[PDB]
Amino acid sequence: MNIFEMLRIDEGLRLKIYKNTEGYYTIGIGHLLTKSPSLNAAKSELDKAIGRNCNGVITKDEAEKLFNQDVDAAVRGILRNAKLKPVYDSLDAVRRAAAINMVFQMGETGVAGFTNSLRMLQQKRWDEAAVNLAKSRWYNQTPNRAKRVITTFRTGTWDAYNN
Numbered sequence: 001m002n003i004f005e006m007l008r009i010d011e012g013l014r015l016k017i018y019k020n021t022e023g024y025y026t027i028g029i030g031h032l033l034t035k036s037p038s039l040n041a042a043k044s045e046l047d048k049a050i051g052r053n054c055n056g057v058i059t060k061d062e063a064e065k066l067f068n069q070d071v072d073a074a075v076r077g078i079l080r081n082a083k084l085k086p087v088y089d090s091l092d093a094v095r096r097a098a099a100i101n102m103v104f105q106m107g108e109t110g111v112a113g114f115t116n117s118l119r120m121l122q123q124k125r126w127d128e129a130a131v132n133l134a135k136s137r138w139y140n141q142t143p144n145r146a147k148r149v150i151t152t153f154r155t156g157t158w159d160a161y162n163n
């Protein structure tokens with residue numbers, strides 16, 4: 001288990017454009033293409049991302065390419081964010097993957113809502129952080145994925161991802 005296998009679990013793999021849990025056009029391993037309701041908008045973004053006229057279908061290889069880029073750029077965002085970096089650096093490797101997971105799903109702007117949880121995680125109050133984490137739209141809207149991420153933050157183990 002590592003961040004790549006974890007996000008593969010949480011996001012699945014689809015080779016055609018689909019809508020994610022928010023109704024937004026997505027492809028691959030949860031690569032968000034656009035928030036526009038226009039399928040043409042999404043297809044243009046896909047072509048832009050892959051570098052060819054895909055017609056809304058990619059290969060597994062191409063999907064994994066987007067995925068590695070997306071992960072990399074998530075971590076890079078964290079390290080450039082003054083509010084997130086101190087917390088990510090306070091964390092062990094397992095919990096860091098949980099942090100990357102949340103950013104992958106909700107963005108940095110998503111995770112800004114989580115100041116209080118962030119503090120509790122930085123203080124290593126795992127059980128308190130876990131309770132606070134779940135008082136969130138995120139938990140309410142995607143409960144099973146959030147439970148797994150919270151378990152990972154609470155325990156510092158991959159237990160929620162074995163199987």
Ligand SMILES: c1ccc2[nH]ccc2c1
Nearest residue numbers: 078084087088099102111
């Ligand atoms: C950096 C980015 C996202 C995060 N979620 C919980 C801790 C944390 C640190």
